[PDB]
Design a protein that fits this description.
bacteriolytic enzyme; Lysozyme; 4 helices; lysozyme activity; mainly alpha; secreted; three-stranded antiparallel sheet; 3 strands; hydrolase; 6% strand; allergen
Length: 129
C-alpha cells in the first residue's frame, strides 16, 4: 500500500504516534514519506546484509528478524515481513520500540535528513486527523 500522507497521518495517529515520545505526528509521517514514500512494501536491501522494511524502513539488523541479517537482535520481536504489512501497526509498534530503545527519531536516517529541521506539520497539514 502506498499511503497518502493524510491517511497515513490518521493511521499513525490512531496508533498513538502523535507525540509519541515527543514526536509529533508530522514527524512520523515525514519519516514515512522519506523513508518509504509511504509505501508499506518498501524494502531496501542493504549491502550490509540488512534490509530496511516497510513504511518506516526499519532495519533488520536490530529491529526485526528477517532471518538473513547478521547480528539480528530482533528487538521488535517480529519478523521483518510483518513490517511490510499494509496495516502499519507492526511498523508503528516497532517504531515505538525503536524509540523506546533509547532512540530518537534520528534512528530514521530519512527523518534525520529530510524531516528534522523541517516543517513536518506540512505532512499533516490539511488532513483529517
Amino acid at each position: 500500500k502506498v499511503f497518502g500522507r493524510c491517511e497515513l497521518a490518521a493511521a499513525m495517529k490512531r496508533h498513538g504516534l502523535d507525540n509519541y515520545r515527543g514526536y509529533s505526528l508530522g514527524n512520523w509521517v515525514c519519516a514515512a514519506k522519506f523513508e518509504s514514500n509511504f509505501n508499506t512494501q518498501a524494502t531496501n536491501r542493504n549491502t550490509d546484509g540488512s534490509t530496511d522494511y516497510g513504511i518506516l524502513q526499519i532495519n533488520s539488523r536490530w529491529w526485526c528478524n528477517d532471518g538473513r541479517t547478521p547480528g539480528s537482535r530482533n528487538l521488535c520481536n517480529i519478523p521483518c515481513s510483518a513490517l511490510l504489512s499494509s496495516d502499519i501497526t507492526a511498523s508503528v509498534n516497532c517504531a515505538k520500540k525503536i524509540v523506546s530503545d533509547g532512540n530518537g527519531m534520528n534512528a530514521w536516517v530519512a527523518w534525520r535528513n529530510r524531516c528534522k529541521g523541517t516543517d513536518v506539520q506540512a505532512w499533516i497539514r490539511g488532513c483529517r486527523l
